[model samples]
Target chain A: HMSLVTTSTSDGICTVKINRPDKLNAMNTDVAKELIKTFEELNHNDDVKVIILTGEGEKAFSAGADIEYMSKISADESVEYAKTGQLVTATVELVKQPTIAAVNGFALGGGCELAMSCDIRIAADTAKLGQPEVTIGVPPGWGGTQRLMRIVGIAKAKELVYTGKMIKAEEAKEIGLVNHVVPLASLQEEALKMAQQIAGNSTMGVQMSKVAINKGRNADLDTGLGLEILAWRNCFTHPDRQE
Target chain B: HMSLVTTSTSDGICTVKINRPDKLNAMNTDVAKELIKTFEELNHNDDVKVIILTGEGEKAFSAGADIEYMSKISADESVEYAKTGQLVTATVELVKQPTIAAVNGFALGGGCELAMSCDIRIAADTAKLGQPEVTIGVPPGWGGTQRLMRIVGIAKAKELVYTGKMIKAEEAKEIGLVNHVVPLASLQEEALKMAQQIAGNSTMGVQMSKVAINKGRNADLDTGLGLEILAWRNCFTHPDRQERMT
Candidate 1:
């Protein structure tokens, strides 16, 4: 039996793939469970300093949730489904190590939300991303509503979600949705290159920077500045700082 | 009949003009009070579906706080002025209808802070925006530090506020400070078009979405996502859903 999520570890980088190309890598419950399990393992895997998330086929990073399964669920079941989806994405965000989403294509709905959870996103030029859940009569159940607003600002995020528009990779990059967009063939290579650069940094420093940025951004300026001050002081406790 | 903050409503869009072109529309205590009063009024006016905030003239959206007056204020008085300024901008943010800032020219310090309070911003190609408060021995007291970081990300926001540099409209758009930029001649027209587009949407749904995203972003991811679920559920209970009975 094929694994729903596959992982390959080499040279401090672990590449995690959503391996359901026949479904355009849509995230069914099993796929979501597998992703959560894979990330939990990587969180404990000391050798993996950086993780790259992608999909198995040439077509999709993920086309989003399984519509067939979703359509059959009752209101109570829908909430559970959304919770599971949110849990998986939030796990991706809380991972101590930096993770990058190498979007290959069609990162719509939950797919877009999943990418947003990663520390950074680099997309193939052919990629299209949006939160289209509103068209199906529900707002994005994952962290889409919040994270999208954080990255692209409220105006653009509201426009995209409210209108259900899919933006291309270039436009995505332009709006700060994805950090960079490269040629379709070079997506993995570019993502790996950036991952390698991050992996070269002081692990303690990089990890602390991530924590500081994530926490500080959510607070008021005075509080955020105070948090940064403490985070800065804490960094000196690392052996790398002495070196 | 001339007032510091003048409002005119037509075709579901309310134009709120900051009238003080003589001082480049700089915000003093009086201008700040007028703004609070104007927004408070429009917040309850049913005929106003959207708002466009701008200066009276092409010279400036605003040159920022009135420095001559600010320089004369005692520390105690300065605190009061800042509190008033914060109150006005916060009022703009809390307005039920969507608000768009039409950045016609210079938007510096408090002027830039005012623009950040709006839901959307449309800048003229000739516009220049910045937060130069540090150069004048103060920080942006009217939500500039927090809102700018929220819009443009922390790193960029820190650099701009620290350096006290003015960014042109195009660069401002690139960094997500302003949503769109048009020629000086078309700024108002473009702003009105966007306001009309938003007005055409399902008001209850659009308003709920704003409430959800605004409230959700301030909470933890788990809590935020949970809030979104409840907000999404509440939308179906609106009378608009029965109208759509399809």
Candidate 2:
């Protein structure tokens, strides 16, 4: 049913590829709605064990939001766009199944933040990642300012966001921006390998680990440990634990 | 008057040194109480612009909790100990003045957690950092698990915490555990220079930035950006902006 962003499920991995290579996968309201709807459709599927997010073309995972649309919006309308961006990213972040961002090429601004929302990021060796909104005289409208700092430490985040620097994949990997990087030709293969590996694990355990990590990292120490204790307690009854 | 921990203020920098070279600065209830009290004393002093935390000896910043004291405490009593640990660390973390950890040497377990609480960490090359609670069959009770995973990503934190491996300064720097590292001989000087540099800046702007960064990073996107906007708006009225010449 979706046209802008398409989903194909194979090997228990639902590869959600963002179409629109012509625009380098620039997201607009239609793309955002389709993305949200795609996830809504995927959430109920029992066959989907993992989700790998990518772009249709090798040129870019996403060049970011549609700048032409942004230029036409009034200040009041900007608020809604910000909300829309956060909604889609959080939807991916809070999904029950684990998500991997298979970053093929240029992932700037909103594109970078979207990847940060996923549990893991596997970037192509040729990829360039950055938050360049500041260069346009506006801060990152999406969750870039927040998620970027959370993924990498505040010090590194400040440098990248302040200078609006586009860093290569190796530097991205060094700074803990991306988990791993490989050649663009094998980007999908590497993503598939990681997705399948994660898929092969105990479903409950893996999902619980993602939940614990997310909730724990976002909370204070006591709150985090409290959540972890509950997740650990639930694990006792899991069939994997008995074996 | 405090014997376990000592404070020295010079050039707007307050150096808080844990005085237990005999124990390699191992922390206990008395030390924690004195540490909490010391900050209470420093909070009212306008002269102290920054706080630098370190140990009295060159051998170790802190080898973590006092093992002898730990061996004697009951399982029921450990709950209170955890509270004590988080309280002191959070005390440093929430201080209006920026805090820097001058990690001189073996900063393990609670020691590493304490450094993580500070806004910045400048480690001496000789320092070895780790969370070894897993080796002792006890998870880190004093926010180590929560904070370690935050400073470094969950993946690297898992490697370090699960393995209970200690690392030198360069490796620590690579993991974003410490911001800068220098030889132990100049640890104090390095910390003071940084302290003075930060201290010389416009007080309101720096402190507000710290508040914004802390509050923002701990929150969701809208909350973070909202706090930033408020901080930015307030800067418009500050004397620094008024001068346009400072």
Candidate 3:
């Protein structure tokens, strides 16, 4: 029997996708660990360039944490799981390589946080995303509060987290959640195309830009802007900078 | 012969809609002062229960400041104008009573900021909203940067501001920018229904709630949550609260 994990390599890029289509690719503890381990291992493999994260079927990329299983956790265990959830998600953001979430379907709660952590997200028109944990009396422990405000802004984030509203794909694009959206049938095709375009660039340059952008995120406003200028300078110094 | 300002009151509520529909409800110095004065007066009026701000006719709520006019401004004037823009929009958010922006048509740039500053926004599905200042080599000057992020989240807000993308009413509601969306014909009717519902509530309690919410915004987690709880307690202390309670 195969574990709920899949990886493939082609043309200087690696893809790690959720393989459990039956549960809409929900992340359980095991799935979370496996994905984290996969990312960690991929970091050492210089042959792998950019990484694409997706789900098994046409239904979902992943639904965040498995609520049913999470609900069964003891109070202490729930807290423990929250820790793991945050760590893996932070790890996803911290990874030096650019990770793109090819969201094929619903991206709710933890799933939304996971997608937010990625460098880019290309979603299907049918995608629905939100952090609905508040509706059920649990605050988001997986960086929804902090990261969402960082991504969307405080007022909008508060309302979304408070009301637990579900957003469709086109609407998601309007608010800038997804980089691009395609029809359900053509979602993967478009995502792969974009991936190929990004991969066409020098891998080292792309990797450095990813780090620069991440560093600039929390830098002081003026310093952060200066860092961006410095990043451009660094790009100019790259061997592939001329090309 | 009409002043740039106009006022109407009904059922203890006042509406000070921007009425330059022919100009697509654009904002100028005169219009801005009129809005500020109207809001200040209404804040002190015991008879005024709520305030409704909108654009006259079907063209726009306010298509923002006059940019063609702005292009001629000196650099110093630009900064001064930006300060006023912040003050005017912030006044809407800081106002005592509940404020609703009934955006029946277009609301771009400063106009969008005006709607965002209000307590709630009602839009017709045909309405277009955005901060398209980038097209003119300017970023949003009227609190769009901070407010948009707070309301819609960072990812979407940056996308909107950076790209200066325009969106329809349904899209606005989806991003939590507009509280409700209705057909163009029924825009004001639906908004007024919600207004009256909120208006008829316990006055002191509602005021306390407004205060609590604004105050809690800058508060840390503990104080913020405690502020809510204390507001609930203060609500129970009011006579109006008892009248509304079973």
By TM-score, how accurate is candidate 3?
Answer: 0.60
Per-residue C-alpha lDDT of model 3 across residues B143-235, encoded as one tens digit per residue: 655566556654555445544557777877776777765455655567777778877776677778897887776546787888889888887
Question: How accurate locally is residue A100 in candidate 2, as Cα lDDT from 0 to 100?
Answer: 76
Question: Comparing candidate 1 with candidate 2, which one achieves the higher DockQ?
Answer: 1
Residue-wise C-alpha lDDT for candidate 2, range A150-243, written one tens digit per residue: 7777789788888887888999999888877788888877777766655554556555555566678767655786665455434444545333
Chain A: TM-score in each model: 0.90, 0.91, 0.86
**How many clashing residue pairs are found in candidate 2?**
0
lDDT of 3 by residue, A122-209 (tens): 8888888877877677888877778766765565678778888788787777756676788888966766665665555455555544
Compute the lDDT of residue A60 as modeled in candidate 1: 85
Ranking by lDDT: 1, 2, 3
TM-score of each: 0.76, 0.57, 0.60
Rank by TM-score, descending?
1, 3, 2
Please name the candidate that would achieve the greatest DockQ relative to the true structure: 1
Chain A TM-score, structure 1:
0.90
Best-matching candidate per TM-score: 1
Per residue, candidate 1 scores C-alpha lDDT tens digits across B1-246 of 124232333467777777776777777778778877767778777676777788765577777744434656568877877778789888887787777776777888778888888777776557878877888788888888888877777889898889888888888777777776555565656677766666655555555666787788776655776677776555555545434323
**Candidate 2: lDDT over CA atoms?**
0.71
| Pairs of residues clashing in candidate 2 | none
TM-score of 1: 0.76
Q: lDDT: which candidate is best?
A: 1
